[PDB]
Enzyme design. Structure first.
Site, short mmCIF file in Angstrom:
data_model
loop_
_atom_site.label_atom_id
_atom_site.label_comp_id
_atom_site.label_asym_id
_atom_site.label_seq_id
_atom_site.Cartn_x
_atom_site.Cartn_y
_atom_site.Cartn_z
CE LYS A 169 -27.05 -41.22 20.33
NZ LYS A 169 -26.93 -39.87 19.71
CE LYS A 195 -32.36 -39.98 13.89
NZ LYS A 195 -31.01 -39.48 14.18
CG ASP A 197 -26.04 -39.43 16.31
OD1 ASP A 197 -26.89 -38.53 16.42
OD2 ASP A 197 -25.46 -39.93 17.30
CD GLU A 198 -27.04 -35.41 15.27
OE1 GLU A 198 -28.05 -35.94 15.80
OE2 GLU A 198 -25.92 -35.41 15.79
CG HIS A 288 -31.66 -34.72 12.99
ND1 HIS A 288 -30.97 -33.59 13.33
CD2 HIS A 288 -31.54 -35.57 14.05
CE1 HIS A 288 -30.50 -33.71 14.57
NE2 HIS A 288 -30.83 -34.93 15.02
CE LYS A 328 -29.28 -35.54 24.08
NZ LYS A 328 -28.48 -36.73 23.70
O1 LIG Z 1 -27.79 -36.79 18.78
C1 LIG Z 1 -28.61 -36.91 19.70
O2 LIG Z 1 -28.44 -36.40 20.78
C2 LIG Z 1 -29.87 -37.78 19.40
O3 LIG Z 1 -29.45 -38.77 18.54
C3 LIG Z 1 -30.51 -38.37 20.62
O4 LIG Z 1 -29.59 -39.23 21.30
P1 LIG Z 1 -30.09 -39.95 22.68
O5 LIG Z 1 -31.36 -40.70 22.30
O6 LIG Z 1 -29.00 -40.84 23.02
O7 LIG Z 1 -30.35 -38.82 23.61
C4 LIG Z 1 -30.95 -36.95 18.66
O8 LIG Z 1 -30.42 -36.60 17.43
C5 LIG Z 1 -31.39 -35.69 19.40
O9 LIG Z 1 -32.56 -36.05 20.02
C6 LIG Z 1 -31.71 -34.46 18.55
O10 LIG Z 1 -32.30 -33.42 19.30
P2 LIG Z 1 -33.75 -32.91 18.97
O11 LIG Z 1 -34.63 -34.14 18.90
O12 LIG Z 1 -34.15 -32.00 20.09
O13 LIG Z 1 -33.70 -32.24 17.62
MG LIG Z 2 -28.51 -37.52 16.94
#
Ligand SMILES: O=C(O)[C@@](O)(COP(=O)(O)O)[C@H](O)[C@H](O)COP(=O)(O)O
Ligand SMILES: [Mg+2]
Ligand SMILES: O=C(O)[C@@](O)(COP(=O)(O)O)[C@H](O)[C@H](O)COP(=O)(O)O
Ligand SMILES: [Mg+2]
Lengths: 469, 126, 469, 126
Positions: A169, A195, A197-198, A288, A328
């Site tokens: 982050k 990782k 972020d996507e 992802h 969340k």
């Molecule tokens: O971008 C985000 O929000 C995260 O990096 C989590 O951040 P935090 O760990 O800071 O919450 C993940 O990619 C989400 O979990 C994706 O959702 P899902 O797993 O439901 O596909």
């Molecule tokens: Mg993410």
């Protein structure tokens, strides 16, 4: 010399050819369960037949070319229609598709038939694909996942607990060197993985190859410091398959263990190619599911995530996000338990109480590791271990980089919480009833955990669920 | 803010971040192995072979991905196939550590249906 | 020596950072218009801020690493929220994204941010992306369409009327040689194009390379017979990018003019690669939008087709299906006219009566030919010409292969109908009022048209519209 | 069922499937050109150069995609830039066909904002 059935031009009801309620499904048929909402005045049998026809062999008016082939052999068949309880205008239409309709090894092709055009028909108001029965004879045409759960644990030498990850982050805006700095500090405190972020691909604030190199330095520094194998999912998601492959090749050449791909925004054709590359070069592939909730959130229309998960299993991925249940983002417990089994297990029996419409036999295709991520913190640890068991990766992005003492202490807090819950479970403690006690005891012991316990003590995510069974 | 030391702080995977397991806590883990019908096994390594390393990659082209030396340790005897008695596992821990008092020793257990190690933790550090 | 703003661990409202109602958008910002339905108890400002944060730079708890960079520079900003009239719990939230957030030339990356995770948040009940403002500075990072409308007409030497196509039927089950036989008979009667069905890839009943060769024979036979340039969209859609490219290469090596790709089921990464290949080798690229209605059908959730069309324009395609308005699949008139302009034109002003939320400047990126296809026949011809004008391809699959006299007469009927409508319009006739008369006059003249007129005279597709503005 | 003849049935793009345009119908198309402000132009070809063909592809590698000979015809004079009088266009049709009575002749019109030909049809067949 009587006349046999010939070509008669013009429109007739789809149900005359495509509604076949006495059809006995074959064990090689692909089966679909559609939640269908017909327009007023359209019989359910006709609506189901239209869905079957326009996802298989038929169009809106009779064509003469049917006679050159055998529509009996090739047609999709609506073979059963069930009312939906609680619903006066929703039906589950079941459609059987001969295995000859599908290109071997192509999730792209399978989706193109089953979900290609039928969701836009004027004659229906809403349509949701709830489940697919993928028969063993079609499963065997896929390479599937590069490695799968057992091989992944064996390559990492990691057994006896969930794996722990963490998204770096701010999502965007960090430089390559700050990315590596954050990664080193996270990994060295006890996380197995970090990782990208996507949406971290290659951007003006941080170009991908710069990130890959600094992340390599961080992985190797943290691995040497801790003595545990480390990884960071380097994102191969790109605008073009050539760029995607260049990124995978760089990870290969740095000797690092794991890359990631956004299978739905990158797409199944690119995903399947990347999975094959990862099989051929020994890279773990984290998937992802970015964009999935565009498709899978609403009960009346779209595609349920279990189908998107089956499709990923087929296309190939070593990990796939599964939701958290308690974090969340949305994911109801029973729904989630059902598709986790569909992701991991070899043989999953029909169970409508978990949204499993068909018995699914994976015929030894490797299982995909579920990844629970998003808005979770140390107090959720007991629930996560209880829901998923050991074969999962639990990811704490904000839950690591939001720790008051920084990333290493944040990582340690999560690792302690996980190990404490794992130990308690192994000792016979019931995590569903004693989870708070387990965490409270661990918070008193570990200073790093105590700091996390205090900061996030009152933080919960409890909302009305949209995606209900 | 406490700083997590980078110095002399190597870890050994599962349960390394908890207080050292007491004898009671080790026995409880052995009970869990036996309750689930998993196959106990002991493994050991001298200090020079106990930690993940990379030296064999000198012989490689660009194929080091998920190759590490020292993931394999040495088997103590054989996996305890059919063992349903925690006291036999504890006796073998004593025998192994008596024979190799300066070695790292870990207790693992195998599931033959998943065909994977399903638990493991260190029981002796030199 | 007072303390400046520092790191404070813990959760705070997203609106403290990401709701910025006095923000003046920059001309390089990517703008999004989200139709947002908050959960009860979640203020619209907080919901909009959550969407902005979790599609840009933020997560659920404060992270210390923000301080190493400039969140002001990178954060997504919810800068305006409008009530939706008729709706007590729907809002349009407008979000601005700095251009630095995006990978150049990557639709995949843009979607991964804007629609990656926010649709699954528990704090909202539904979310729909209605529009995106793609600024010229980001448009210029894309190769875009291989050729675009003007170049396509110039390569084909075809001017002064809509183009005519036709999907071969049965969708599946025909052999390669029967495919070519059908194609030859269609093309020779006056259709410019035929095409593989979207789900015709490579299958047990017909392997792709066999089809490509027999289709080549048919194209060249029909072209020699008629003296008009002919094409058939050979499907490059495949399970892997390597298979997709092998199919494109075979089309190149046969010298044929046009291939097709299913951009959403194949995916944007593979599509963008294929578009670049088509630019480099002079192939026209027809894009099929299979799966779009999974995403775009419902008003409350998903992504509107106009955004999917913009995304395709950027990734690249010479054609894109646009709907028909009057045929078997849904597409309301005003909605459709709006996104047709967004597909074809250089500069499209904001117009909420056609669903255009932002002025869009394409900065000379080629226009994409709209393809009207699905459940249309000769009586729809006046309406189609009126709606689309000449820069469109009108496709009659069932409307050709369902003609009582076979494919050549079916093709001739459609070509006569189109030419009659075009001539009438050019002479000053109002097709919206005189269309029936034009077709009736043409039916009396042409025997082939008369047969089609009779068979489909009472066939209409008139249903309540789901995707209303 | 009537069979569409494959024999001696070559076509010339827009309006080839309608009855041959009368003089009134040609004049109406010229009016449409002038009403929309498009640029009229005449093009012509001898019979041997009027039909799409492939002979130059003998000189190619694998780059024939959307290459055909005989798409270009020969320009009659210049495009009638500024022409807002249908009678001038009709006079040029007469002049062109008088000069080349055995040629294929087509009337086209250009839009300079799209920079594309926006209409065209045959006005003379040998
Ligand atoms: O971008 C985000 O929000 C995260 O990096 C989590 O951040 P935090 O760990 O800071 O919450 C993940 O990619 C989400 O979990 C994706 O959702 P899902 O797993 O439901 O596909
Ligand atoms: Mg993410
Ligand atoms: O599969 C079909 O139904 C078609 O081949 C049309 O067949 P007919 O010509 O026989 O109707 C087209 O792919 C649809 O038009 C796609 O829908 P859209 O254009 O809305 O994306
Ligand atoms: Mg089709």
């Amino acid at each position: 010399t009587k006349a046999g059935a010939g070509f008669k031009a013009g429109v007739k009801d789809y149900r005359l050819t495509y509604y076949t309620p006495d059809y006995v499904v074959r064990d090689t048929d692909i089966l679909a369960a559609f939640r269908m909402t017909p327009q007023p005045g359209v019989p359910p049998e006709e609506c189901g037949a239209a869905v079957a026809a326009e996802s298989s062999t038929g169009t809106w008016t009779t064509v003469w070319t049917d006679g050159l082939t055998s529509l009996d052999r090739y047609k999709g068949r609506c073979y059963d229609i069930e009312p939906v309880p609680g619903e006066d205008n929703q039906y589950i239409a079941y459609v059987a598709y001969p295995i000859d309709l599908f290109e071997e090894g192509s999730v792209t092709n399978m989706f193109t038939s089953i979900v290609g055009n039928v969701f836009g028909f004027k004659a229906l108001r809403a349509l949701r694909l709830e489940d697919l029965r993928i028969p063993p004879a079609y499963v065997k045409t896929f390479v599937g996942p590069p490695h799968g759960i057992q091989v992944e644990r064996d390559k990492l030498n990691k057994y006896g607990r969930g794996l722990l990850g963490c998204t770096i982050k701010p999502k965007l805006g960090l430089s390559a060197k700050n990315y590596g700095r954050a990664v080193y500090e996270c990994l060295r405190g006890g996380l197995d993985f970090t990782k990208d972020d996507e949406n971290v691909n290659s951007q003006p604030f941080m170009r991908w190859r710069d990130r890959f190199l600094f992340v390599a330095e961080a992985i190797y520094k943290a691995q040497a410091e801790t003595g545990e194998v480390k990884g960071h999912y380097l994102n191969a998601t790109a605008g073009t398959c050539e760029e995607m492959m260049k990124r995978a090749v760089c990870a290969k050449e740095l000797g690092v263990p794991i890359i990631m791909h956004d299978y739905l925004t990158g797409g199944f054709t690119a995903n399947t190619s990347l999975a094959i590359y990862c099989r051929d070069n020994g890279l773990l592939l984290h998937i992802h599911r970015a964009m999935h909730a565009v498709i899978d959130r609403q009960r009346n229309h779209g595609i349920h995530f279990r189908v998107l998960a089956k499709a990923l299993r087929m296309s190939g991925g070593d990990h796939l996000h599964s939701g958290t249940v308690v974090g969340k983002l949305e994911g109801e417990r029973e729904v989630t338990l059902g598709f986790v089994d569909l992701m991991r297990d070899d043989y999953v029996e029909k169970d409508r109480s978990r949204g499993i419409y068909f018995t699914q036999d994976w015929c030894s295709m490797p299982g995909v590791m579920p990844v629970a991520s998003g808005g979770i913190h140390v107090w959720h640890m007991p629930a996560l271990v209880e829901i998923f068991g050991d074969d999962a990766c639990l990811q704490f992005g904000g839950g690591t980089l939001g720790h008051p003492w920084g990333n290493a202490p944040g990582a340690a807090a999560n690792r302690v919480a996980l190990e404490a819950c794992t130990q308690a479970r192994n000792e016979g403690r019931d995590l569903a009833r004693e989870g708070g006690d387990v965490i409270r005891s661990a918070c008193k012991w570990s200073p790093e955990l105590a700091a996390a316990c205090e900061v996030w003590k009152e933080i919960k995510f409890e909302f009305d669920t949209i995606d209900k069974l | 803010m406490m700083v997590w030391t980078p110095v002399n702080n190597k870890m050994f995977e599962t349960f390394s971040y908890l207080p050292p397991l007491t004898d009671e806590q080790i026995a409880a883990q052995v009970d869990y192995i036996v309750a689930n019908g998993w196959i106990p096994c002991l493994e050991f390594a001298e200090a020079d072979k106990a930690y993940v390393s990379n030296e064999s990659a000198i012989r490689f082209g660009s194929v080091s991905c998920l190759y590490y030396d020292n993931r394999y340790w040495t088997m103590w005897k054989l996996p305890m196939f059919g063992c349903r008695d925690p006291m036999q596992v504890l006796r073998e821990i004593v025998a192994c550590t008596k024979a190799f008092p300066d070695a790292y020793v870990r207790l693992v257990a195998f599931d033959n249906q998943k065909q994977v190690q399903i638990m493991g933790f260190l029981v002796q550090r030199p």
